[PDB]
Design an enzyme around this catalytic site. Structure first.
Site, PDB file in Angstrom:
ATOM      1  N   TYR A 160      17.043 -36.017   7.125  1.00 53.17           N
ATOM      2  CA  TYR A 160      15.630 -36.207   6.896  1.00 53.17           C
ATOM      3  C   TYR A 160      14.868 -34.957   6.614  1.00 53.17           C
ATOM      4  CZ  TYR A 160      11.016 -37.932   8.860  1.00 53.17           C
ATOM      5  OH  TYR A 160       9.734 -38.379   8.918  1.00 53.17           O
ATOM      6  N   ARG A 210       3.701 -40.315  -4.011  1.00 53.45           N
ATOM      7  CA  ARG A 210       3.393 -39.194  -2.950  1.00 53.45           C
ATOM      8  C   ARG A 210       4.521 -39.331  -2.019  1.00 53.45           C
ATOM      9  NH1 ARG A 210       1.947 -36.767   1.248  1.00 53.45           N
ATOM     10  NH2 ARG A 210       2.335 -38.284   2.777  1.00 53.45           N
ATOM     11  N   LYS A 265      13.933 -43.357   6.179  1.00 47.76           N
ATOM     12  CA  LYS A 265      13.170 -43.937   7.379  1.00 47.76           C
ATOM     13  C   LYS A 265      13.897 -44.854   8.219  1.00 47.76           C
ATOM     14  CE  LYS A 265       8.949 -41.716   6.734  1.00 47.76           C
ATOM     15  NZ  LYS A 265       8.188 -41.256   7.664  1.00 47.76           N
ATOM     16  N   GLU A 282       4.856 -46.421   2.963  1.00 41.74           N
ATOM     17  CA  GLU A 282       5.308 -45.151   2.959  1.00 41.74           C
ATOM     18  C   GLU A 282       5.156 -44.467   1.851  1.00 41.74           C
ATOM     19  OE1 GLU A 282       6.299 -42.005   5.438  1.00 41.74           O
ATOM     20  OE2 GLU A 282       6.806 -44.137   5.995  1.00 41.74           O
ATOM     21  N   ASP A 283       4.572 -43.335   1.807  1.00 41.63           N
ATOM     22  CA  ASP A 283       4.351 -42.550   0.789  1.00 41.63           C
ATOM     23  C   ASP A 283       3.667 -43.010  -0.695  1.00 41.63           C
ATOM     24  OD1 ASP A 283       5.386 -40.601   2.220  1.00 41.63           O
ATOM     25  OD2 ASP A 283       7.170 -40.074   1.157  1.00 41.63           O
ATOM     26  N   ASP A 313       2.680 -45.376   7.458  1.00 43.00           N
ATOM     27  CA  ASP A 313       2.912 -44.396   8.403  1.00 43.00           C
ATOM     28  C   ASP A 313       2.454 -42.805   7.895  1.00 43.00           C
ATOM     29  OD1 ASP A 313       4.733 -43.119  10.113  1.00 43.00           O
ATOM     30  OD2 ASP A 313       6.494 -43.111   8.804  1.00 43.00           O
ATOM     31  N   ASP A 314       1.844 -42.733   6.967  1.00 45.19           N
ATOM     32  CA  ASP A 314       1.245 -41.355   6.486  1.00 45.19           C
ATOM     33  C   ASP A 314      -0.096 -41.307   7.056  1.00 45.19           C
ATOM     34  OD1 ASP A 314       3.289 -40.464   5.231  1.00 45.19           O
ATOM     35  OD2 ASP A 314       2.889 -42.177   3.601  1.00 45.19           O
ATOM     36  N   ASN A 345       5.048 -31.564   4.477  1.00 47.71           N
ATOM     37  CA  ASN A 345       6.599 -31.527   4.360  1.00 47.71           C
ATOM     38  C   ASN A 345       6.825 -31.564   2.781  1.00 47.71           C
ATOM     39  OD1 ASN A 345       7.250 -32.040   7.277  1.00 47.71           O
ATOM     40  ND2 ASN A 345       6.366 -33.958   6.804  1.00 47.71           N
TER      41      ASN A 345
HETATM   42  N1  LIG Z   1      -4.828 -26.238  -2.486  1.00 44.33           N
HETATM   43  C1  LIG Z   1      -5.375 -26.851  -1.796  1.00 44.33           C
HETATM   44  N2  LIG Z   1      -6.435 -26.560  -0.747  1.00 44.33           N
HETATM   45  C2  LIG Z   1      -6.891 -27.167   0.205  1.00 44.33           C
HETATM   46  N3  LIG Z   1      -6.858 -28.548   0.140  1.00 44.33           N
HETATM   47  C3  LIG Z   1      -6.133 -29.166  -0.836  1.00 44.33           C
HETATM   48  C4  LIG Z   1      -5.370 -28.126  -1.672  1.00 44.33           C
HETATM   49  N4  LIG Z   1      -4.527 -28.846  -2.327  1.00 44.33           N
HETATM   50  C5  LIG Z   1      -4.542 -30.234  -1.760  1.00 44.33           C
HETATM   51  N5  LIG Z   1      -5.672 -30.299  -1.112  1.00 44.33           N
HETATM   52  C6  LIG Z   1      -6.060 -31.591  -0.062  1.00 44.33           C
HETATM   53  O1  LIG Z   1      -4.975 -32.211   0.648  1.00 44.33           O
HETATM   54  C7  LIG Z   1      -5.316 -33.551   0.672  1.00 44.33           C
HETATM   55  C8  LIG Z   1      -3.937 -34.252   0.381  1.00 44.33           C
HETATM   56  O2  LIG Z   1      -4.421 -35.629   0.736  1.00 44.33           O
HETATM   57  P1  LIG Z   1      -3.262 -36.769   0.462  1.00 44.33           P
HETATM   58  O3  LIG Z   1      -3.818 -38.374   0.720  1.00 44.33           O
HETATM   59  O4  LIG Z   1      -2.750 -36.374  -1.035  1.00 44.33           O
HETATM   60  O5  LIG Z   1      -2.029 -36.335   1.147  1.00 44.33           O
HETATM   61  P2  LIG Z   1      -1.636 -36.409   2.773  1.00 44.33           P
HETATM   62  O6  LIG Z   1      -0.940 -37.317   3.286  1.00 44.33           O
HETATM   63  O7  LIG Z   1      -3.089 -36.201   3.453  1.00 44.33           O
HETATM   64  O8  LIG Z   1      -0.992 -34.784   2.968  1.00 44.33           O
HETATM   65  P3  LIG Z   1       0.509 -34.417   4.080  1.00 44.33           P
HETATM   66  O9  LIG Z   1       1.501 -34.339   2.954  1.00 44.33           O
HETATM   67  O10 LIG Z   1       0.047 -33.135   4.478  1.00 44.33           O
HETATM   68  O11 LIG Z   1       0.494 -35.522   4.876  1.00 44.33           O
HETATM   69  C9  LIG Z   1      -6.386 -33.774  -0.304  1.00 44.33           C
HETATM   70  O12 LIG Z   1      -7.740 -34.272   0.311  1.00 44.33           O
HETATM   71  C10 LIG Z   1      -6.496 -32.806  -1.308  1.00 44.33           C
HETATM   72  O13 LIG Z   1      -7.944 -32.614  -1.579  1.00 44.33           O
HETATM   73  O1  LIG Z   2       7.958 -37.414   7.043  1.00 48.28           O
HETATM   74  C1  LIG Z   2       6.906 -37.432   7.362  1.00 48.28           C
HETATM   75  O2  LIG Z   2       6.379 -36.464   8.397  1.00 48.28           O
HETATM   76  C2  LIG Z   2       5.744 -38.108   6.851  1.00 48.28           C
HETATM   77  O3  LIG Z   2       6.266 -39.193   6.195  1.00 48.28           O
HETATM   78  C3  LIG Z   2       5.073 -37.218   5.576  1.00 48.28           C
HETATM   79  O4  LIG Z   2       5.240 -37.893   4.488  1.00 48.28           O
HETATM   80  O5  LIG Z   2       4.763 -35.979   5.536  1.00 48.28           O
HETATM   81 MN   LIG Z   3       5.644 -40.153   4.525  1.00 51.18          MN
END
Ligand SMILES: Nc1ncnc2c1ncn2[C@@H]1O[C@H](COP(=O)(O)OP(=O)(O)OP(=O)(O)O)[C@@H](O)[C@H]1O
Ligand SMILES: O=C([O-])C(O)C(=O)[O-]
Ligand SMILES: [Mn+2]
Ligand SMILES: Nc1ncnc2c1ncn2[C@@H]1O[C@H](COP(=O)(O)OP(=O)(O)OP(=O)(O)O)[C@@H](O)[C@H]1O
Ligand SMILES: Nc1ncnc2c1ncn2[C@@H]1O[C@H](COP(=O)(O)OP(=O)(O)OP(=O)(O)O)[C@@H](O)[C@H]1O
Ligand SMILES: Nc1ncnc2c1ncn2[C@@H]1O[C@H](COP(=O)(O)OP(=O)(O)OP(=O)(O)O)[C@@H](O)[C@H]1O
Ligand SMILES: Nc1ncnc2c1ncn2[C@@H]1O[C@H](COP(=O)(O)OP(=O)(O)OP(=O)(O)O)[C@@H](O)[C@H]1O
Ligand SMILES: Nc1ncnc2c1ncn2[C@@H]1O[C@H](COP(=O)(O)OP(=O)(O)OP(=O)(O)O)[C@@H](O)[C@H]1O
Ligand SMILES: O=C(O)/C=C/C(=O)O
Ligand SMILES: O=C(O)/C=C/C(=O)O
Ligand SMILES: O=C(O)/C=C/C(=O)O
Ligand SMILES: O=C([O-])C(O)C(=O)[O-]
Ligand SMILES: O=C([O-])C(O)C(=O)[O-]
Ligand SMILES: [Mn+2]
Ligand SMILES: [Mn+2]
EC number: 1.1.1.38
Lengths: 551, 551, 551
Positions: A90, A143, A161, A233-234, A256-257, A399
């Site tokens: 993981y 993502r 997963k 997922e992602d 999941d996210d 992560n």
């Molecule tokens: N450099 C940065 N400083 C502050 N915020 C940021 C920055 N870069 C990206 N972000 C913000 O982080 C958020 C990412 O959201 P996204 O839906 O793409 O992923 P997430 O699943 O929320 O994130 P994680 O990977 O932490 O689970 C966006 O709202 C973006 O504006």
């Molecule tokens: O693994 C995790 O914790 C989650 O699926 C992520 O994308 O950050």
């Molecule tokens: Mn994920």
């Protein structure tokens, strides 16, 4: 099936563990060494070889390769020490595997559906060998963790997963289906990589994409059933919410996210409150990022507060967000979608330029990192939180490890051991210069989706409401012992993930029936026994035909 | 078969090289990534990973594992650079693999017949999946290379031998069968090894052993045919000769260690003679060891001399042998069997105590090491040979590397570059202090058994006479170019082993037909074309069903 | 799977109807004659051969044999003329086939579970090839039609019943499972028959019998689902009721001889009332027999009268029964079980000795024959009914024909065309000496079980209440047109059984949802379209793999 095919299928292959009688009756005699081994001996062979290896990627290739050779042994091995192998199968290593997926490829895993297959998706679903799928984990690879768009290289995620579905909750492997939706990739590096496993085209963002996903949902449920659990997922931010909204009422699906992460985060917050016991009125949460995780966690936090007195309107006002364009304030130049509106406040006295300014101006008691963009929780940000709060709550959930907002060492050291820290990726214990030892917990959705998926599957649930994740959140935290809390753990030890997942499943099954969301009949009297009786085991089963004499 | 089974079977699996049309028509669409690859891309992936690896054993596990996933790709990869991979798939690494076979086990290969299966061997043979086996390589593991008794761990040898059947001579993989006869082992360490793959008992040396072997020969020929090629490999000294004598006129069989090694060594001698041009009368050959290889080489050398003038009696007098008990002289205390008698001479004036003494007393022009016991060709032995001869011939044929009589560096440095050296294991080029560079050749039976096996199979030969090996020896040497001899090579470069094997096969088939030993009809006009048209290739074949329009 | 196996499996075999492309892509090219046929040509070949045959048993062997060669063609053939083939595949010929089952045997059909397999029933169920069974028809062969105990020879009944499930209601053949429970037989003739296909022992009537049925019910539902439809057919009187009562609330089950027959009989009575319009108070029903059918029909008649005014107590008083021991009156010597109590009244002025006396003393308006004992409705009984009623209702439901209470010719002739007649077996139209022509209806449960089963299955119904059969009875009669009643038909023409079954199913499905007995989600808007869209069709399906180019 008998003969060699039994050995070629990882699902039935036992290696030298096939008994003498099984071998003779199934036509395996002579195809295996004379020696009859036990699973214990096979596990030993594994641990001996693993101990000699050096790099995590090498170990990942080795253990994941076992899943394609001997499924039962594969899970037995994970079960032997899930804690030490979690970082390999993981996060963070899985992130490394996906980036290199085309370089380490040996055998394909899962179903691959491309935009070029539009209009023929059902034909693809009918090619999958298993007839009774109950759980699907799908991704388009836009993502992957905090790594960005990895296209088909992202298939490693769904595969990982699902291993946890089984390893943690006992969900039958043959009833899990990893799926990768391939509509192209915007990753320029992969478009020039001769080893890339996907279509060499930019991501198709037209209605054809939405149509493909629609076709997919329909083809999956047509073959396997309307209540087939489908875990998204992602997926990129835009698609994630709209697909969840569009399908959560028509199919048995969840993201999941947005929801799984929301629940683990909440579980961690409830544990912290158990130690800080802060007046509900003095709660102030600042999010670094405002996407899938932030909005998911925010919504679940609001539900927890509303069920605790506060109204939805007053709970949402205690939550602030700071994205890549800055603090989400009304009338800001940067976009503000419908999901963010409830958490978009009127611009404060002075608008913060950096996250550090936001911390000093808003003076949050809790800081949650979910930007997936690296070390945004700088030494100054952390130092500010320790000067503003006696026991500051700092969560760096992004992560893999390189994308984490800050490390455990930084958090504990820079706050002099006064913070309650949690991270998405693993970090070892931290010992301060004064001798105090802190054991940070992992706020990763692996503590949630396994148990919740099992309950939903066992109860023949048709749709998953957000209140399910609220319950899972509570079930997860209710298992934390005061001794573990003392160590600095906001979550149950990863070593007990198996038991913890089952207990969460039991609690969620009870919730599903009590709220008339379970359609499995008859309703079991003892939910605990009901769940425990149905968990898949890694012990070998006898493959002997039923021979007996007639009286 | 259609569907997933096509991908689970290494014989048919093409991985991402399955074409779009093949996937759609064979039910693979969706089970493979969207990308359609070529074998070239797959080969590149392999070489990329291989370069990042460190140990030879790790590389062995990786490449042999490919044979279990994608057979065609496995042979393509060997064909890309057989010279660099020979040391990993064959000597010396294969010897290391065997000694650790039970520790690295993942999937079985070949047929295992144990003494506990006596009376049921035919049912075991019927369990083997392939229906048209044409070549069998069997061992009881009592004499694996120069490593001794390794029991079932010795299965790595027949597996390796057969890889070369295909890689070198294009013998169809599906028509090859590696076999391991397990009747116990006298290796005390293995009897206490929890990972041992055989029966935990000492070697059965009663008539039951002979019975078992007889049952096997009969079972193999009953199912596949009386002309099935059966290659005996690594059997102990006693059994090796008696089984060859007992079966050679009954079945199509030969022993690689007696006859195969005999032909390669003779090939080397004929090449050396091409540079030394020594009068046949002053040929004096001294063997270190007097077993399988020594007797095999001696008898073949005698056949060469007789066919060149000398009588059988006078050619044998030119050959002396020195075994573990000393020089073989009439009336010595140590046993002298029928095979050794012809080379056991009247005790010289003074009976040598050591091999060095035998060299100084007998003053041999050629020294051949085949004792499988380490560095017996000491610096003193080599110096003596250089003082006695202007161009001493020194052959250290024992395998693996650690059991060799001496290294190439020792031979060339201690004779100031005047020796004609050859070894069983690979040694890189040697550069003397004065700058001269010598490239030693490998006198290993891998230059003989592939080509001989192909010719015998293609000609439907029933029995293999010793004269066949004499002809293979000449065929091998006749390919040496004057320029290669100049470098110090007594054999064609290993990099051209494919073409060398095919040429040997063409020569042998011509020999078989001219001497009425071939029964394949009709007799082909052009033997060269006949052989080349029937060699298996590693290029992917089309799996598409024949679809066409009707008038 | 592809190749010859596609032709050996009747489920996929199309004979010469396989298209040229299907043959080339599925590896069938050359295994079939060059000619490409259509199903129409195949049907024609059948009708041409059937026309030349003489005996019904010969015709049964031929067409039932088609079911084991080309399933699609088999059903197309039935569908071409269900009315002319009904007497051959069903009553009366199916009764002849069963009594001769072991003599005409060629291939087995269905699952056989014997008392000797107790403790291993699940392993037998796992041997059935199809994995998605939805309907099971099971018998123990103790009460085959009116033929009695035929042991395993009774398997012909469940096989026949299931053919009608498909031919009449479009239930998928692959989801139907014929079952025969073998615990011995009391038929002395079969116990000495060398061709008997069951256990050579008397019927086991101990708790072991009950235990076996329990094990079977649990095993079937364990593998296929708790809502699997289980139709009990032809069980003896004692076991039929107690198995119904014991299981109706635990599984999705019903008894065709008690409930199926009850509903079709009621349908006929409702149709007769349509033409006689008798005051509900003057209804007097006399039963010849007091078993499965009698008690079933009586209970349903009472439900109909209760929902039309009368009280349960007052409706039961209008029903009388006469069994093998005479009229059922309080305090009689012959036993009276709990089910008969409600219809056992205080002895009349004089106790009738024969059935004819019962008619003259009770003066019933309706006479229902369900004794399965032959011509008990003697000419005297019929004339008495005609003298007592202007329009006597006479039902001779016992099967096969030889066991019928009387023939259509006798009923119409002896009542001068004034009776409303119906029988369990087919009788052609009857023309009286005066020229009037009467077309009698078949009151056989084949009009009911197909439509009810389809509705229960499509609605995912868990248990079947008696009210479902009442609704089916009404749905059947509501399809009778005034013009058909005029001819003397009390039931819709047999030729329209397909449409009639579909209509009953649509009605029942609406009934199940309205009463909260359907669990299939979501609830369909238009039940009519819902049902029609899911009916299996006998037209060939394309077996071509999905081929298309990638843009
Ligand atoms: N450099 C940065 N400083 C502050 N915020 C940021 C920055 N870069 C990206 N972000 C913000 O982080 C958020 C990412 O959201 P996204 O839906 O793409 O992923 P997430 O699943 O929320 O994130 P994680 O990977 O932490 O689970 C966006 O709202 C973006 O504006
Ligand atoms: O693994 C995790 O914790 C989650 O699926 C992520 O994308 O950050
Ligand atoms: Mn994920
Ligand atoms: N360990 C498991 N992993 C995945 N799915 C499971 C697992 N155990 C049970 N299920 C599913 O949970 C649901 C309810 O469980 P239950 O034991 O009632 O199954 P069932 O319907 O009786 O059995 P079957 O699935 O064999 O028909 C079923 O749909 C079943 O497929
Ligand atoms: N590349 C090969 N590897 C192993 N055996 C081969 C190979 N090529 C041909 N043979 C065998 O060599 C023998 C003579 O070759 P030939 O081409 O005459 O075969 P054949 O009898 O026409 O073909 P088949 O083996 O399909 O019946 C045959 O017994 C054949 O099985
Ligand atoms: N230490 C030693 N010094 C001299 N001769 C030895 C020594 N040890 C063993 N030998 C001899 O070497 C010979 C080995 O014969 P064996 O048949 O066992 O193997 P081989 O196949 O001839 O050897 P190789 O492994 O080189 O192919 C015997 O004659 C034995 O006496
Ligand atoms: N023609 C048929 N014969 C027998 N059973 C049928 C038939 N058609 C549908 N069914 C069953 O009726 C029930 C409801 O039908 P529906 O169309 O909702 O099925 P589904 O659950 O979507 O499909 P599936 O059975 O493929 O999972 C299902 O259990 C289905 O198996
Ligand atoms: N000779 C007879 N005269 C009057 N009644 C009879 C006679 N013979 C048998 N019976 C009665 O017929 C009834 C048969 O009941 P059983 O449950 O065995 O079959 P059934 O399914 O009701 O009949 P059918 O075959 O007509 O559907 C019994 O009550 C029995 O007493
Ligand atoms: O020990 C075994 O049998 C398997 C090992 C592996 O698949 O690596
Ligand atoms: O590149 C491939 O398709 C196969 C790789 C392997 O078998 O290791
Ligand atoms: O195939 C048949 O006609 C009969 C077979 C049998 O009697 O078993
Ligand atoms: O490979 C070899 O050189 C030979 O087979 C041996 O046993 O030494
Ligand atoms: O076919 C029928 O009418 C009924 O099933 C019976 O057994 O008589
Ligand atoms: Mn050897
Ligand atoms: Mn019946």
């Amino acid at each position: 099936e008998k003969g060699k095919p039994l050995m070629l299928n990882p699902r039935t292959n036992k290696g030298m563990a096939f008994t003498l009688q099984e071998r003779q009756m199934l036509g395996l005699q002579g195809l295996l060494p004379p020696k009859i081994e036990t699973q214990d001996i096979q596990a030993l062979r594994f641990h001996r070889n693993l101990k000699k290896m050096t790099s995590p990627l090498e170990k990942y290739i080795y253990i994941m390769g076992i899943q394609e050779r001997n499924e039962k042994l594969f899970y037995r091995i994970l079960q032997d020490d899930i804690e030490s192998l979690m970082p390999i199968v993981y996060t963070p290593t899985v992130g490394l595997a996906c980036s290199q997926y085309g370089h380490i490829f040996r055998r394909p895993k899962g179903l691959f559906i491309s935009i070029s297959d539009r209009g023929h998706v059902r034909s693809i679903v009918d090619n999958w060998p298993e007839n009774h799928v109950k759980a699907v984990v799908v991704t388009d690879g836009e993502r992957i963790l905090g790594l960005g768009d990895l296209g088909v290289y992202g298939m490693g995620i769904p595969v990982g997963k699902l291993c946890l579905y089984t390893a943690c909750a006992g969900i039958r492997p043959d009833r899990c289906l990893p799926v990768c939706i391939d509509v192209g990739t915007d990753n320029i590096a992969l478009l020039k990589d001769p080893f890339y496993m996907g279509l060499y085209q930019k991501r198709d963002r037209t209605q054809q994409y939405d149509d493909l996903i629609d076709e997919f949902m329909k083809a999956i449920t047509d073959r396997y059933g309307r209540n087939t659990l489908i875990q998204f997922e992602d997926f990129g931010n835009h698609n994630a919410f709209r697909f969840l909204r569009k399908y959560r009422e028509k199919y048995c699906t969840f993201n999941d996210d947005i929801q799984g992460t929301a629940a683990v985060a909440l579980a961690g917050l409830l544990a912290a409150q158990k130690v800080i016991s802060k007046p509900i009125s003095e709660h102030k949460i600042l999010f670094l990022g405002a996407g899938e995780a932030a909005l998911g966690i925010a919504n679940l936090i609001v539900m927890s507060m509303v069920e605790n007195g506060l109204s939805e309107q007053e709970a949402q006002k205690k939550i602030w967000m700071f994205d890549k364009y800055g603090l989400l304030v009304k009338g800001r130049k940067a976009k503000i979608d419908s999901y963010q509106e409830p958490f978009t406040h009127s611009a404060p006295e002075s608008i913060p330029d950096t996250f550090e300014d936001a911390v000093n101006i808003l003076k949050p008691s809790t800081i949650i990192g979910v930007a997936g963009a690296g070390r945004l929780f700088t030494p100054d940000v952390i130092r500010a939180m320790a000067s503003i709060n006696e026991r500051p709550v700092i969560f760096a959930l992004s992560n893999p490890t390189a994308q984490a907002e800050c490390t455990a060492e930084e958090a504990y050291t820079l706050t002099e051991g006064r913070c309650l820290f949690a991270s998405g990726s693993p970090f070892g214990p931290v010992k301060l210069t004064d001798g105090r030892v802190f054991t940070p917990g992992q706020g990763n959705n692996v503590y949630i989706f396994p148990g919740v998926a099992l309950a939903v599957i066992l109860c023949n649930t048709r749709h998953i409401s957000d209140s399910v994740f609220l319950e899972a959140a509570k079930a997860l935290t209710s298992q934390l012992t005061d001794e573990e809390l003392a160590q600095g753990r906001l979550y149950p030890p990863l070593a007990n993930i198996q038991e913890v997942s089952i207990n969460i499943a039991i609690k969620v099954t009870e919730y599903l029936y009590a709220n008339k969301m379970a359609f499995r009949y008859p309703e079991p009297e003892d939910k605990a026994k009901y769940v425990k009786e149905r968990t898949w085991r890694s012990e070998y089963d006898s493959l002997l035909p039923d021979v007996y004499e007639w009286p």
